[PDB]
């Protein structure tokens, strides 16, 4: 009928088209991240001048509006048009998921909870070993780059093809990028979990898999992870700020991944974002934020948005592990 369990609301009427112009967005107050927004825009300015030139007109109007007070009731003064998105149910409830840059805690020697090795490219003979055999010690220790404290975290890193490591000694954050793969074709761990009815298809994502790994034992996670005989190898790489497909450095909660054919890179968004409690559940509150589409995702389609939460543990907690809903207005300036 009309569920509200995940942030849904139904006080903006029913929509008959993807985007609908509104006199004033149904959102009281002003955006709370004016500073991050400005910073995000500065990154587009320097990192993607082409994209900036094509959108500066909108960015400028928004900035002018923000400096003048930023209240949503005064947007028209600056020629800013608000096109509300119908969302997933045509009631304006836009599907939100989150993602962030994990910082894996690892050490140079296996100690305490640090028992899970991350490897660099071994010789051809070594690459024939399956994930299960490698977990069993098939590979020499000379090929270990570090020992993380999470088996599932390593796997998520394998899927990404790279990741950041903190050795916890005050040295610079370490980055490792894709070096190669082992000789076994990979299998979808997400599929396995859906089959075992452990996770709903609609809520499946890397975050969902990460959550499952935090709510299950090491034995259970290893049993699951071996279902995928494939394995990834890395190599040291110089540090580079996290960027989206658009090649622009991403600012936490001021940028999202979107479907290019629906929300082109550079598009400005005003959004009522749902907040989550410690159990990743909608706590009944929303934050008004400005964000820019600067990334894409294999499973981010339609009017679905993945909010980049940032880097580290706090960003992770805000990410969540299943869908939630808020309202979003595309900001533009009538020519």
From Swiss-Prot:
Q: What is this protein called?
A: Membrane-bound lytic murein transglycosylase A
Q: What is its main location?
A: membrane
GO biological processes? cell wall organization; peptidoglycan catabolic process; peptidoglycan metabolic process; peptidoglycan turnover
Which terms are listed as keywords in the entry? Answer: Cell outer membrane, Cell wall biogenesis/degradation, Lipoprotein, Lyase, Membrane, Palmitate, Signal
User: Which organism does this sequence originate in?
Assistant: Escherichia coli (strain K12)
Gene responsible for this protein: mltA
How is the activity affected by temperature? Loses rapidly its activity at temperatures above 30 degrees Celsius.
Stated role: Murein-degrading enzyme. May play a role in recycling of muropeptides during cell elongation and/or cell division. Degrades murein glycan strands and insoluble, high-molecular weight murein sacculi.
Q: What is its EC number?
A: 4.2.2.n1
GO cellular component annotations of the record = cell outer membrane; outer membrane-bounded periplasmic space
Q: InterPro entries per the record?
A: 3D_dom, MltA, MltA_B, RlpA-like_sf
């Amino acid at each position: 009928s009309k569920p509200t369990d995940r942030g849904q609301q139904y006080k903006d009427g029913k929509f008959t088209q993807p985007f609908s112009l509104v006199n004033q967005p149904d959102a009281v107050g002003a955006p709370i991240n004016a500073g991050d927004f400005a910073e995000q825009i500065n990154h587009i300015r320097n990192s993607s001048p082409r994209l900036y030139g094509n959108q500066s007109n909108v960015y400028n109007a928004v900035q002018e509006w923000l400096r003048a007070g930023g209240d949503t009731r005064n947007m028209r003064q600056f020629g800013i048009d608000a096109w509300q998105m119908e969302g997933a149910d045509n009631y304006g409830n836009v599907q939100f998921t989150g993602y962030y840059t994990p910082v894996i805690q690892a050490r140079h020697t296996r100690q305490g909870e640090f028992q899970y090795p991350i490897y660099r490219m071994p010789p051809k003979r070594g690459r024939l070993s399956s994930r299960a055999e490698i977990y069993a010690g098939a590979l020499s220790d000379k090929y270990i780059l570090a020992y993380s404290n999470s088996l599932m975290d390593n796997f998520i890193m394998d899927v990404q093809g790279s990741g950041y490591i903190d050795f916890g000694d005050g040295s610079p954050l370490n980055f490792f990028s894709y070096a190669g793969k082992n000789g076994h074709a990979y299998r979808s761990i997400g599929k396995v979990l859906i089959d075992r009815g452990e996770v709903k298809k609609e809520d499946m994502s890397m975050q969902a898999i990460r959550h499952w790994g935090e709510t299950h034992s090491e034995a259970e996670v290893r049993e699951l992870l071996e279902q995928n005989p494939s394995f990834v190898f890395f190599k040291p790489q110089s540090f580079a700020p996290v960027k989206g497909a658009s090649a622009v450095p991403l600012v936490g909660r001021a940028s999202v991944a979107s479907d290019r054919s629906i929300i082109p890179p550079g598009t400005t968004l005003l959004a009522e974002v749902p907040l989550l409690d410690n159990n990743g559940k909608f706590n009944g509150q929303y934050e008004l934020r400005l964000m820019v589409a600067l990334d894409v995702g294999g499973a981010i389609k339609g009017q679905h948005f993945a909010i980049y939460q940032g880097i580290g543990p706090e960003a992770g907690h805000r990410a969540g592990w299943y869908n939630h809903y808020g309202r979003v207005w595309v900001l533009k300036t009538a020519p």
